[PDB]
C-alpha cells in the first residue's frame, strides 16, 4: 500500500530530483515528460496526487487539468515557472488544489502534499 | 460556507480583507489580538480561520497547533515570513495552505475556494 504520484514535467532533471526526492518519502513515482502521455497516464491509472507543470509539449498543463477534472477528483497540484496572479487563480479555479511557482524548495512541495493528503 | 475568522494585527489589511470577504459573501470575525483569535477559533464555529504568524500574545503557529489539536476546520495562514522553515512549519503543524505577503486578493479568494472543497 504505497501512495502513487505522477509527475508531468518537461524538464528532465528536475523531473528526475522530485522522483528521487518523493521516492526517498516512500510514495511510489511515475513520471512523464509530455502532456499528452501525461494526459493519457492520469486517466488510466489511479494516482493519489498528480503534479503538473504548465508549459508541456503536445498539450499544456490547464488542458491536462481540465481534462483530469472531467473525470476524477484527484489532488492536483500545479508546477510553474509562471507566477502572475492570473495564472494561479485560472490554475486553482480549474481544480487545481494547490499552485507553486519554480524554482521552489523540495521541502515545501513535501508539506504541500502532506496537507493536502491529510484531508483525502 | 460562509463563516470566516482573520486572525491579523496589521489592521489595515485585516478591515480590507473583512471588506472584500464581506463583499463575497462571507461573514466575516475578525481578531487583531493573538490570543482573543485563538479564544475567538475555540469558542465559536468557523469554516476557515486565517491566521497571520507574527501577533501579539501568541504567534499564529501555536494557536494552529492548538486549533487543530481540537478542530478539523481548515485554516490559511497569510505572513510576510518567506523562509522555507517557516512554511513547512505552518503547513505540518495543520494548515492547509500558506500565503506569503504581499498577495492579491483574487489569490487568496482562490485559495479559500480551492481548501474548501477539500472538505
Ligand atoms: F513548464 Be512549466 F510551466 F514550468
Ligand atoms: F504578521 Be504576519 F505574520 F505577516
Ligand atoms: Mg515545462
Ligand atoms: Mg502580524
Known amino acids: 500500500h504505497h501512495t502513487q504520484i505522477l509527475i508531468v514535467e518537461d524538464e528532465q532533471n528536475l523531473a528526475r530530483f522530485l522522483e528521487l ?3 526517498h518519502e516512500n510514495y511510489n513515482v511515475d ?5 499528452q502521455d501525461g494526459l493519457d497516464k492520469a486517466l488510466s491509472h489511479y494516482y ?3 503534479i ?3 508549459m508541456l509539449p ?5 488542458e491536462i487539468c481540465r481534462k483530469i477534472r472531467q473525470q476524477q477528483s484527484t489532488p492536483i497540484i500545479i ?4 507566477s502572475d496572479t492570473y495564472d494561479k487563480v ?8 494547490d499552485y507553486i511557482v519554480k524554482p521552489f524548495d523540495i521541502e515545501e512541495l513535501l508539506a504541500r502534499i ?3 493528503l491529510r484531508r483525502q
Open 21 to 23: 526526492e518523493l521516492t
Open 31 to 35: 513520471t512523464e515528460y509530455d502532456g
Open 48 to 50: 493519489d496526487l498528480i
Open 52 to 54: 503538473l507543470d504548465l
Open 58 to 62: 503536445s498539450i499544456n498543463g490547464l
Open 79 to 82: 508546477i510553474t515557472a509562471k
Open 90 to 97: 485560472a490554475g486553482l479555479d480549474y481544480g487545481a488544489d
Open 114 to 116: 502532506r496537507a493536502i
